Nucleic acid binder design. Sequence first.
RNA 1: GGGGCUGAACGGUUUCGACUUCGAGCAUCGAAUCCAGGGAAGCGUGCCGGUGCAGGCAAGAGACCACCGUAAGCGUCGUUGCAACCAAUUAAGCGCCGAUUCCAAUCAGCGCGACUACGCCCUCGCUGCCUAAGCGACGGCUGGUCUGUCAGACCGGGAGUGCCCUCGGCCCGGAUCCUGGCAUCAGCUAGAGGGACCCACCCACGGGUUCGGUCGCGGGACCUGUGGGGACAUCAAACAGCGACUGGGAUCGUCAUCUCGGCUUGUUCGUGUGACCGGGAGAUCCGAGUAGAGACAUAGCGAACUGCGCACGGAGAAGCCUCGAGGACAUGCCGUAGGACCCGGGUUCAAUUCCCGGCAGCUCCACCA
RNA 2: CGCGGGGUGGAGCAGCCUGGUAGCUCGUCGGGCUCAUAACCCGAAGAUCGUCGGUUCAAAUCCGGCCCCCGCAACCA
Length: 161
Amino acid sequence: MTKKSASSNNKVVATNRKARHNYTILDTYEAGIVLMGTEVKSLREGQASLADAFATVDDGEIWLRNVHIAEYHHGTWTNHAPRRNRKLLLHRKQIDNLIGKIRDGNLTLVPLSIYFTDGKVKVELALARGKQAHDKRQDLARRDAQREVIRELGRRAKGKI
RNA sequence: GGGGCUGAACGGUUUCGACUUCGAGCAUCGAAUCCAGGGAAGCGUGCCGGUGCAGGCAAGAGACCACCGUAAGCGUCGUUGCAACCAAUUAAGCGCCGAUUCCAAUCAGCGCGACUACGCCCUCGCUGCCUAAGCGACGGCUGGUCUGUCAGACCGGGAGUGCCCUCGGCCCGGAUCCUGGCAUCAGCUAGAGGGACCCACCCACGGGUUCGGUCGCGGGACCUGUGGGGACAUCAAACAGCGACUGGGAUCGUCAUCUCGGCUUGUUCGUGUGACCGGGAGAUCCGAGUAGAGACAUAGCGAACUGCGCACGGAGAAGCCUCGAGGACAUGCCGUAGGACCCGGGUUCAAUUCCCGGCAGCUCCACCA
RNA sequence: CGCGGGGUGGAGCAGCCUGGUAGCUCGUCGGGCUCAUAACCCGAAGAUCGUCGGUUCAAAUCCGGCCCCCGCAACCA
């Protein structure tokens, strides 16, 4: 299963296992991070990151902030603000259906797989929720630090990386 | 220190898909979607009035100030405001630190052992005995200065019944009844009583507010105040406080006809009707009905509109109808056209890749300088 | 002594080949959360560009000199 039976090549660049360990399976959308020509060659060798990330609803557009990019080969590189504002392209037909849901039961927006096509890229968003039900402190302290750690360190070794 | 194997490397590399210029919509967008270089009242109107900005919009306001006879802009004062606005984040809190209470008692343990008003309001003397009134003050024998209790009077009543005869320290008392015989004495100074009363027949008065009223009408004429140690106001005959009889006295009552009265047509009116018409929820002669159970409206014909006084011809916002979709101008959302080929130039779509080449960081060189 | 580069609130970094209103991170001040501190969050203030002189309408920017720092060179008989 590459890209619809046999039509294109899309299998390079692994999937970050952080979203499949602290979240669940419910909603799954597709988007595309607008990047420059420098960030293209910094993700072909499989140099991703496992840092925190959160979206930021602005008017009608989405801005996924807090991201870490390698950009390092042999010597020093001047770079160009790795933690900038990268507008994510989408469809007003989907956006409007996400702002009203992300600002309800305290939901987030974390990426799934990073599909690197012919030079270009394609991020896979998802609308999920944590393993716990809101915050209870006393009633939510023994299941988020014991059972959640097993699902994070157990499912990672099963799917290669 | 200089050239460069490399930084996305047959050119078919518009992610279905974002912005931002275009077709469409105008749903918000300095606006009760617009307005006049337009008209009408015998060619029009008036007897005084307008505008705002020091401070890009708006108020409390003095009627500031002056205009060729023919149209114009202040910042007077006190409050002057918007220049005052405390504008929000994500799923990882058991990691540092916390005292507890009314009857007696207040560091703990042990040996003894319990308090003042609860049953006492309310001086003093004998018992029984409430957890034990330290034989004394309740429930009761008895002993005293302290006076509990069948209580008046505006009953002036036949029928049972004179309903009874003293009061804040008693205005005066325990004599006929609660010492026992023999049916009610701790009120020892606080048992917080229950009271100004409930009218035998007739001395006389009144006849008044229902198509008036009342003397004979249902009332033996009546009701009632009052009188017996001290005196005066009514009845209405079974539909309505707007119900009933032929006749006598009180202040002799009421419904309706014509000369008093109401009007003159979008602003002023000649020229008349006229002191005329109104049987209008207006009086008044006289009659009828049983009453105050009740019912119609004064209009038509044409002289002035500053063109008969002072001025001007859109005088300066008193009202309605006609010419004209006032431009989608004011403005930025929606299906998509377009993608940035390590930042820059040619470029049959994008082009380190097939050409022109600028910087980090790594590989190659013809030297002692 | 030669060449190149560098100086930007308290500090480390933009911007300095194109002279038209100098920004980020951290820290400080003030206002919340907690018993309190730290962490998290926010508002506000703070640098006329090392100094001293020209050109231009306008100089942190172009140019020259002086005072410092850094890299290289400082060396065949």
